[PDB]
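Work Package 4 report. The design task specified in the project plan requires that, given a folded chain encoded as structure tokens, an amino acid be chosen for each position. We show below one input record used in the internal validation round.
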């Protein structure tokens, strides 16, 4: 069952493989793989070649065409001894795509065959040096039944093709860029193809090809459009062009993650490709955009420069997430992007950094590498890259990117290499900054202020510390870029300065405790603190309600207005959760409701921003405010708050809802912002007088000319338990049952229902005609949404949620351990809950620990959780 691997153990490989020639005789039941690799020894003469392989049937081994006798198979490996220094290795083996339920390696997605090799899936295809610092030039020949698999795709360009007897054919591909094997891809199947072209700024014409299941071609143009937008943006912002002749994307229905950046042949979860205005929401459109961009941006940050080892995952993922965010932000509402990314950081990643699974963005220890494709590596990773950007500014940051590619193009690099490039290009010292790579947990930054009217000085006294996490007992101060702005009482910025000279508004918070003194502060300021969430930290500062509403009215950056609103609410969320636990109803000062009233009626606020201020923090974001989480109190308080605001703001809500009506549906940023505001008003309106609400919601649902508006109405019906809910839910089922992606939204609504009988409805749905345990998207929509997005039901006092999740994980552990491990995450958070909950959650985890054939993926999490 073991065994953890450790970053500090990295060693350069004893052998390299420079070129690999693959042939697949493809069949669902039995695929024959022939792999001819050119190998070179780099380590000691007597070192055996250790190849990784899993679930392979070895047929033969030859070395320079000599059948080899000096080898043995061991657990996960083929160990070949007594080799020359350079030689040709030839392996023949068999695998069975149809048996592959874990969806790693070569597997079946409906009638298609496709691959997923990151992290360590290639070893499920043949015996190989399945480690990302081994880089080979691939040539791939695919042979298959012509009728079942008319399209035979791999990385690169087509260099040969032929027909064979018995209705077979083949295509051979060649990719000139050396690659680690996690970037190998193969697809075989029968597809509709949308083809288009992008012309790079230096005049290279790239053929673009999007492969979708037959009948899905009508849902492809947005994705193709987003790809072109991605290519253009990476040229304009980063100076990067695509480096091949063709760019293929294949949308498949059975896929564990969102998508995969395989060189020239990305494979996508169809969730992040398929859109039409009646099937997909504005959010889907902007997610498709994000993820198409992300995989495209990987071509440089990931493919042209790869990872020395898997502990360096954030080198590509943090950076590529930063890039997808800058892309979304440049194209759309930068404020909305930042706000949402901050909501994700505070509401979801902070929770992980306080969990038993906590790790630094560059982990030190890993048992199952698929457990480290995390909010931390990705989202916190990007926040770290963004801190570098904050510290260097754009021009220097882009010089660091240039030095990074100039030094590392065509190699496997480390996080440390990236930091060094940024430091050397910029001349900004990032020694201390590197500690963000090696330390887990969320720093807490404590600020106290003092204004001195005699000296006309404002002084901030800033402290930091990070609590211990289960993985690390010593913690040390980080280099926290801590952006401020100071406002006079009319809302003007006060120049920051000291002893005659300008001071940078990004303060360098590097120690446990420091003081910063600003001079020439003629009037007592109101500060904005941690502007743009300039570091991924908790901020402890004793805001007055009035300072916060002042900021809501006057802060220069849209984000600071939002964030001031969140700090205003936070006090009253905490108040009312304590009240709720004593049986006391919601209490909200009049002046708080008035601050949201003012936002509804301020004509000068960008509606994109108004919408976000009028979107209350989620139950996950609310949970981050507390030492011990009470999910039932949080959920009832969020409901009560919503009903309070609905009552107090009813007329203003209706007015803004009506004013933002749009007869034309467009996927355009201004339109989206208006719709988002409209629908934010709708959420409150749904909790007004019952009949009025029922009529308004039902009308939106029935008269919508797009899925954004239909879903928002259905969601509101569900959330407020309106009388129309059952009829609208049944209508959506009747209309959409045949469409998995669209039914996923309905599964989410079912799983997150506040109805008393939600669990029972969810169990029933395991037999629904649109549900299947074979499909990860369906799993995550129904089961995962219950456990992870309905904490109130998941954490029902009778413990029924935990038992339900145990039953589901008991199946998934064997079927698909990666989706199992995603779904176990809520149970591993047990120590945030009260003792009675902890006790039932430990018991659920102890049941799981006892499973016959416990996957490594779950073993890792369960062990940390029970510690
Ligand atoms: N492969 C990623 C998603 C997309 C990406 O990181 O490139 C994951 O498995 O979570
Ligand atoms: Na071959
Ligand atoms: Na073996
Ligand atoms: Na990836
Ligand atoms: Na990559
Ligand atoms: Na923008
Ligand atoms: Na595994
Ligand atoms: Na994976
Ligand atoms: Na809000
Ligand atoms: Na949380
Ligand atoms: Na906008
Ligand atoms: Zn990625």
């Amino acid at each position: 069952q073991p065994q953890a691997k450790y970053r500090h153990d990295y060693r350069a490989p004893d052998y390299q493989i420079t070129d690999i020639d693959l042939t697949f005789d493809l069949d669902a039941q039995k695929t024959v793989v022939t792999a001819v690799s050119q190998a070179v020894r780099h380590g000691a003469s007597d070192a055996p070649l250790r190849l990784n392989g899993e679930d392979l049937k070895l047929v033969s081994v030859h070395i320079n065409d000599e059948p080899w006798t000096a080898w043995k198979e061991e657990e996960g490996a083929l160990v070949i001894s007594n080799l020359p220094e350079r030689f040709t290795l030839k392996i023949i083996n068999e695998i069975s795509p149809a048996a592959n339920t874990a969806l790693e390696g070569l597997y079946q997605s409906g009638d298609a065959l496709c691959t997923q090799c990151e992290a360590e899936g290639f070893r499920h295809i043949t015996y190989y040096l399945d480690r990302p610092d081994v880089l080979a030039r691939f040539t791939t020949k695919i042979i298959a039944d012509k009728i079942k698999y008319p399209f035979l795709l791999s990385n690169g360009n087509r260099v040969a093709q032929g027909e064979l007897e018995n209705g077979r054919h083949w295509v051979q591909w060649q990719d000139p860029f050396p690659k680690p094997c996690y970037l190998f891809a193969l697809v075989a199947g029968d597809f509709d193809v949308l083809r288009d072209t992008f012309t790079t700024r230096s005049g290279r014409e790239v053929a673009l090809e999007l492969y979708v299941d037959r009948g899905n071609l009508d849902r492809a143009p947005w994705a193709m459009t987003s790809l072109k937008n991605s290519m253009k943006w990476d040229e304009e912002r980063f100076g990067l062009e695509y480096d091949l002749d063709i760019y293929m994307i294949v949308a498949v229905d059975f896929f564990n993650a969102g998508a995969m950046e395989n060189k020239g042949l990305n494979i996508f979860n169809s969730k992040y490709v398929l859109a039409r205005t009646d099937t997909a929401t504005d959010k889907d459109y902007l997610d498709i955009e994000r993820v198409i961009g992300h995989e495209y941006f990987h071509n440089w940050t990931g493919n042209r420069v790869t990872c020395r080892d898997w502990f360096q995952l954030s080198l590509k993922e943090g950076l590529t997430v930063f890039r997808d965010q800058e892309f979304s932000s440049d194209l759309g509402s930068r404020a909305v992007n930042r706000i949402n990314n901050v909501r994700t950081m505070r509401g979801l990643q902070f929770a992980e950094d306080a969990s038993p699974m906590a790790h630094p963005i560059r982990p030190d220890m890993v048992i199952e590498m698929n457990n480290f494709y995390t909010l931390t590596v990705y989202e916190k990773g990007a926040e770290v890259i963004r801190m570098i950007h904050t510290l260097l500014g754009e021009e220097n940051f882009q010089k660091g990117m240039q030095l990074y590619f100039e030094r590392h193009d065509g190699s496997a690099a480390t996080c440390d290499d990236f930091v060094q490039a940024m430091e050397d290009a910029s001349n900004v010292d990032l020694s201390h900054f590197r500690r963000w790579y090696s330390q887990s947990g969320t720093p807490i930054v404590t600020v106290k202020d003092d204004y001195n009217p005699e000296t006309e000085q404002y002084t901030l006294t800033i402290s930091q510390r990070t609590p211990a996490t289960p993985d690390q007992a010593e913690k040390q101060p980080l280099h926290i870029p801590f952006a401020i702005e100071l406002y006079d009482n009319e809302g003007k910025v006060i120049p920051l300065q000291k002893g005659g000279h300008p001071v940078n508004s990004v303060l360098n918070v590097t120690q446990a405790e420091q003081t910063f003194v600003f001079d020439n502060v003629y009037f007592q300021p109101v500060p904005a603190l941690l502007c743009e969430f300039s570091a991924p930290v908790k901020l402890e500062y004793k805001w007055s309600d009035q300072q916060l509403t002042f900021l809501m009215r006057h802060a220069r950056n849209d984000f600071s207005r939002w964030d001031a609103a969140q700090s205003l609410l936070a006090t009253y969320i905490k108040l009312n959760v304590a009240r709720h636990q004593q049986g006391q109803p919601l209490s909200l000062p009049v002046h708080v409701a008035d601050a949201f009233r003012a936002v509804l009626l301020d004509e000068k606020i960008d509606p994109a921003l108004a919408a976000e201020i009028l979107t209350l923090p989620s139950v996950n974001e609310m949970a981050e405010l507390f030492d011990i989480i009470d999910p039932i109190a949080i959920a009832e308080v969020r409901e009560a708050l919503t009903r309070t605001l609905a009552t107090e703001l009813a007329d203003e809500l209706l007015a803004i809802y009506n004013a933002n009506y749009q007869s034309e549906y467009r996927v355009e940023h201004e339109d989206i912002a208006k719709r988002t505001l409209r629908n934010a008003c709708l959420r409150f309106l749904a909790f007004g007088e019952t009949h009025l609400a029922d009529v308004l919601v039902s009308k939106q649902f029935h008269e919508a000319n797009n899925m954004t508006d239909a879903l928002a109405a259905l969601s509101a019906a569900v959330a407020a338990q309106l009388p129309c809910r059952d009829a609208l839910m049944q209508e959506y089922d009747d209309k959409w049952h045949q469409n998995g992606l669209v039914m996923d939204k309905w599964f989410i609504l079912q799983a997150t229902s506040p109805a008393a009988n939600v669990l029972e409805t969810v169990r029933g749905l395991l037999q629904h005609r649109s549900f299947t345990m074979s499909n990860p998207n369906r799993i995550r929509s129904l089961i995962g949404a219950f456990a992870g997005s309905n904490p109130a039901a998941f954490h029902a006092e009778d413990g029924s949620g935990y038992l339900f999740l145990v039953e589901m994980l008991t199946d998934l552990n064997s079927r698909n351990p990666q989706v199992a491990s995603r779904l176990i995450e809520p149970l591993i958070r047990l120590k945030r809950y009260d003792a009675k909950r902890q006790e039932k959650m430990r018991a659920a985890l102890e049941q799981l620990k006892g499973l016959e054939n416990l996957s490594g993926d779950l073993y890792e999490k369960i062990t940390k959780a029970l510690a």
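The chain has five domains: 12-191, 192-276, 277-440, 441-542, 543-867. Validation will be extended to a larger panel in the next phase.
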